[PDB]
Design a protein around this ligand. Structure first.
Ligand SMILES: CC(C)[C@H](NC(=O)[C@@H](N)CCCNC(N)=[NH2+])C(=O)O
Ligand SMILES: [Ca+2]
Ligand SMILES: [Ca+2]
Ligand SMILES: [Ca+2]
Ligand SMILES: [Zn+2]
Length: 262
């Protein structure tokens, strides 16, 4: 039997233009997606190649907008903060009031999700989101998602309008790594592991939505599990976690994030 671990979420909406101050419906829509994806209740789980049907996992995690604030008072679980900042980066400016963002709530008790309009990587690439893996400082613990890739209504835009950027980032929050192993440009593309036996060794990230099979690193005939949430495919194309990933998530919940357990 699964222990359903129920994670209180606080959504920090950080907005410059009014349109960035996203609706309650848009936020709720994202929560609803998390509650499908992390319970194997997403209808599109039917898209997984049958050869891997046996590996599809129910992570046994559910999410709710916090009902009590950090001091035990009634809350909506949503903060809304106006800013003069026009973009944020992986350097965590969104996570501090002093840099035009919003401070984290206590990371031992809440999953902090920040939503902002524009995110850039350190090299200036526009990106959709980023996470902090377990073990990092509480001050910056959580996930950040751009509003146009958050939820399934309002400002969300295809092909990132099915709530999967958050599923992917919360995957990292729960100690899951990119399925292809994150090689640096000069490294052998088949050399790094995601530390999960049941995810096939994979050369590079997949984008868009590959045709099955997409073989790499001699992983034929079945090929890359590109429909896994820890690849880089479009929202409608990623639809599953594996049981091997659930093992890692379970270790995370039992150890560094054990504070979330009942
Ligand atoms: C850095 C790459 C190019 C970039 N990745 C992200 O923004 C990543 N943090 C989230 C991927 C979300 N994918 C999805 N289907 N919801 C990118 O993919 O462009
Ligand atoms: Ca940092
Ligand atoms: Ca693997
Ligand atoms: Ca690889
Ligand atoms: Zn990622």
């Amino acid at each position: 039997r699964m222990e359903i671990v129920k994670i209180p979420v606080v959504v920090h909406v950080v907005w410059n233009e009014e349109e960035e101050n996203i609706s309650d419906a848009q936020i709720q829509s994202q929560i609803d997606i998390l509650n499908k994806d992390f319970r194997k209740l997403n209808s599109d789980v039917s898209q997984v190649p049958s050869v891997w049907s046996n590996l599809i996992a129910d992570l046994g995690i559910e999410f709710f907008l916090a009902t009590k604030d950090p001091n035990g008072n009634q809350t909506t679980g949503i903060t809304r903060t106006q800013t003069s900042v026009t973009f944020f980066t992986t350097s965590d400016e969104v996570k501090f009031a002093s840099s035009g963002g919003e401070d984290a709530w206590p990371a031992d008790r809440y999953l902090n999700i920040w939503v902002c309009h524009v995110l850039k990587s350190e090299i200036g690439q526009d990106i959709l989101g980023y996470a902090q893996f377990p073990g990092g400082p509480a001050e910056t613990d959580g996930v950040v998602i751009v509003d146009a890739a958050f939820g399934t209504t309002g400002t969300a835009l295809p092909p990132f309008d099915k709530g999967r950027t958050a599923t992917h980032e919360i995957g990292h929050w729960l100690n899951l790594y990119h399925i292809w192993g994150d090689e640096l440009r000069f490294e052998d593309p088949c050399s790094r592991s995601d530390e999960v036996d049941d995810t096939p060794n994979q050369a590079d990230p997949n984008f868009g939505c590959p045709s099955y099979p997409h073989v790499s690193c001699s992983n034929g005939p079945n090929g890359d599990m590109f429909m896994n949430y820890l690849d880089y495919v479009d929202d409608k194309c990623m639809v599953m976690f594996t049981q091997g990933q659930a093992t890692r998530v379970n270790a995370c919940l039992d150890g560094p994030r054990s504070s979330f357990l009942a």
